[PDB]
Ligand binder design. Structure first.
Ligand SMILES: O=C(O[C@@H]1Cc2c(O)cc(O)cc2O[C@@H]1c1cc(O)c(O)c(O)c1)c1cc(O)c(O)c(O)c1
Ligand SMILES: O=C(O[C@@H]1Cc2c(O)cc(O)cc2O[C@@H]1c1cc(O)c(O)c(O)c1)c1cc(O)c(O)c(O)c1
Length: 146
């Protein structure tokens, strides 16, 4: 039995099975391996429909949801290939002020964060990273650190 959110799927290009998580939007070839609090970092990319279309990076955020998702997807690719660390990309590109702490949000319990972010955070095991996670803030890559 796979951990919460995890399902088995089949690659359309290769035919090999892989696993994906409908809570975190994580996807991976490898078969995957609750606390009161978790600690996470996150890289946020805002779009024009974000609850506040503004950040420390850009006074007015005009990119579309679709453009934001492409950016998030490129960052996940660089992180997964090891070309860049999550921390480096968060510091340079995240629209959240936690960028200045390499994305770190510190520790939190259920009841504090936006719900899709929270659910993703608590479905990650320590060390694991989400796929694109959508909230009223924009699109997040989430990394569970504790
Ligand atoms: O539906 C296929 O792709 C989906 C749409 C799509 C696209 O439009 C452009 C692109 O860059 C990637 C891409 O990934 C999609 C996709 C979805 C899956 O669930 C999947 O397992 C996969 O390998 C891929 C598909 C079917 C195929 O039969 C196939 O041989 C293939 O290589 C791909
Ligand atoms: O401009 C942002 O903060 C404002 C300026 C600022 C600063 O220069 C240094 C500092 O120590 C704190 C600080 O608080 C300001 C602030 C203003 C608000 O109206 C607000 O709601 C808020 O959370 C905070 C900002 C951008 C962001 O992108 C962001 O994620 C964020 O939380 C905050």
């Amino acid at each position: 039995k796979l951990p919460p959110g995890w399902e088995k799927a089949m690659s359309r290009s290769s035919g090999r099975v892989y696993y994906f998580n409908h809570i975190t939007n994580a996807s991976q070839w490898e078969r995957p391996s609750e606390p009161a609090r978790v600690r996470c970092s996150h890289l946020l990319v805002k779009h024009s429909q974000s609850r506040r279309p503004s950040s420390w990076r850009q006074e007015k955020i005009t990119r579309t949801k679709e453009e934001a998702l492409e950016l998030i997807n490129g960052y996940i690719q660089k992180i997964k290939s090891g070309e860049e660390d999550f921390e480096s990309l968060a510091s340079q590109f995240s629209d959240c002020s936690s960028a200045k702490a390499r994305g770190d949000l510190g520790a939190f319990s259920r009841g504090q964060m936006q719900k899709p972010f929270e659910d993703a955070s608590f479905a990650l095991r320590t060390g694991e990273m989400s796929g694109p996670v959508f909230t009223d803030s924009g699109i997040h890559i989430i990394l569970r650190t504790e």
